[PDB]
Write a protein that binds this ligand. Structure first.
Ligand SMILES: [Mg+2]
Lengths: 105, 94, 195, 49
RNA sequence: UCGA
DNA sequence: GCATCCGTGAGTCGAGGGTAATAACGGCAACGGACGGGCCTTGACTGTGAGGTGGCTCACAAGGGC
DNA sequence: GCCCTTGTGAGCCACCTCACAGTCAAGGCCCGTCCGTTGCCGTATAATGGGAGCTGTCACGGATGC
């Protein structure tokens, strides 16, 4: 059980890259700060589902680990999901309330 | 979102320059073992272990916070590389 | 089950004692290595003897076990032994206690010549021994004899040379032939427990 | 494939994504250290450990 | 032949 | 100037199982390879020898305890 | 009031600390020796022009052809 704590120590502050095919635009890949969870499933934030065109009918995603300090910097600054909220195409917001959120509000 | 990311983007004409500065500074910190930091003991980033608060292992966080302080100077052709490296190795050995 | 070659070690001092061993075939030595590099033979493990005893009480081996011949050993899990197995282990450990104490007495009994004769006669009753035309013999080096007679190689070689001049034994290729059992018996005085 | 203990394929479109992000060192990692650069991947593993 |  | 043929393209990522079948031969000759041994190049052991030198060897005359 | 264990002291006698030779043994190499496997020729009735095709795109750029 100590190696899991060690793994918690290792990934501290670091981010990973999530990708979904087909990757149509640059938001087909995004950076996320990983939170270790039990189970064999990757957990994705709802708001980014539109940019990935992702849904939960059995879709799969790939994870990548940026190794260098430079790569990590690039991922955390340029590629982070929270830093990309607007469409590079229309300039309109991409990460926005949808479905159930809209319903409730 | 990373803390003060908008202000960090403010400090640079290009986001990629911010990224380069952060990365290189992180390399400096890693190389010299954090003893060249511009941060104060109470400004040091912390991480919660089972034991308790310890120094944050992540150098990028350090570099970004340091940059946010303003105590760092970045630009082009500020100093020859060899001279910089040697003065750093003199002030903070390995 | 596992086979070991001559001079190969079964386990090392300070290493995890997870396995108890029983010698099925061959001859094993239990020894200790000093910082100064001197090697000392602490006890002889014969077929049927249990060794790696540290597995029964501690976490790591305290001494090194080295095969003196081609050896066949059986690995055992201490925690998985029944009444009968524990009985055999107890009895055998008692036997090895008696033999190691007798060996203790041997190491301090008589001059080097007597100790050497006694050790040769002891080895004559071990798997280290065999026989051909020249007579009964034992496959053992002078270094090992020194390690098991509380002395150093040089003096042992000297005494063996004396015995060669006297016609009691003959030696070649780490192989020593015992030509006169009676004379060696007289030199040793008291015999060493072989079982 | 999982059966060969294989790695994921980083294809043309993914490369396009990395280019669009302007993440040059990440892309370089994908093209070199994490793939067919032998000396590079050896030295990288050794450096990380 | 599948899955998205 | 306007039909016509030829060459080249035609989304990404991931998953699991499958692979063969065949009609021509002897008479020599000689390499190329398995084998049995003898000369080596060390590596692990014998067989001295010359210097020191510990600590067994071997009898005295009682001091404290029970 | 009688046992258990002590403190010197002089003198050898095997046993250990260097310093070196020779000595027996094992993978290793080369030899040649032999033997198995491989490469080559010669086969004289007459023989004398192949054989499997693969079919339901589709649109463009470019050479080529009346
Ligand atoms: Mg779906």
């Amino acid at each position: 059980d100590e190696v899991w704590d060690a793994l918690e120590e290792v990934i501290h502050g670091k981010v990973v890259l999530l990708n979904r095919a087909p990757t149509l635009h640059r938001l087909g890949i995004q950076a996320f700060q990983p939170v270790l969870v039990e189970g064999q499933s990757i957990q994705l934030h709802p708001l980014v589902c539109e940019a990935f065109n992702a849904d939960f009918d059995g879709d799969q995603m790939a994870v990548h680990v940026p190794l260098s300090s430079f790569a990590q910097a690039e991922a955390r600054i340029q590629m982070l999901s929270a830093h990309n909220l607007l469409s590079p195409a229309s300039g309109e917001p991409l990460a926005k309330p949808s479905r159930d959120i809209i319903l409730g509000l | 979102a990373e803390p003060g990311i908008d202000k960090l983007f403010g400090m640079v004409d290009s986001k990629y320059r911010l990224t380069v500065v952060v990365a290189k500074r992180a390399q400096q910190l890693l190389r010299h073992g954090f003893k060249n930091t511009v941060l104060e003991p109470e400004e040091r980033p912390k991480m919660q272990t089972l034991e308790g608060l310890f120094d944050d292992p992540n150098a990028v966080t350090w570099a970004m916070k340091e940059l946010l302080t303003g105590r760092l100077v970045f630009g082009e052709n500020l100093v020859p590389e060899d001279r910089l490296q040697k003065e750093m190795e003199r002030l903070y050995p390995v | 089950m596992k086979r070991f070659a001559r001079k190969e070690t079964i386990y090392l001092r300070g290493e995890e004692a997870r396995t108890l061993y029983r010698l099925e075939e061959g001859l094993v030595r239990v020894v200790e290595l000093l910082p100064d590099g001197r090697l000392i033979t602490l006890r002889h493990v014969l077929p049927g003897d249990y060794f790696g005893e540290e597995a029964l009480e501690g976490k790591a081996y305290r001494y090194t076990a080295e095969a003196m011949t081609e050896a066949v050993v059986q690995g055992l899990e201490p925690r998985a032994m029944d009444h009968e197995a524990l009985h055999r282990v107890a009895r055998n450990l008692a036997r090895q206690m008696r033999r190691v104490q007798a060996y203790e007495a041997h190491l301090q009994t008589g001059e080097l010549r007597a100790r050497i004769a006694r050790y040769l006669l002891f080895l004559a009753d071990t798997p280290l021994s065999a026989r051909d035309r020249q007579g009964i013999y034992v496959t053992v080096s002078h270094e090992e004899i020194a390690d098991a007679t509380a002395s150093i190689r040089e003096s042992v070689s000297k005494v063996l040379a004396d015995l060669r001049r006297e016609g009691l034994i003959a030696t070649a290729y780490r192989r020593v032939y015992l030509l006169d059992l009676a004379a060696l018996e007289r030199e040793a005085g008291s015999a060493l427990e072989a079982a | 494939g999982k059966a060969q203990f294989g790695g994921q394929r980083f294809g043309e479109m993914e490369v396009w994504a990395l280019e669009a992000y302007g993440a040059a060192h990440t892309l370089q990692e994908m093209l070199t250290l994490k793939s067919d650069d032998i000396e590079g991947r050896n030295a990288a593993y050794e450096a990380i450990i």
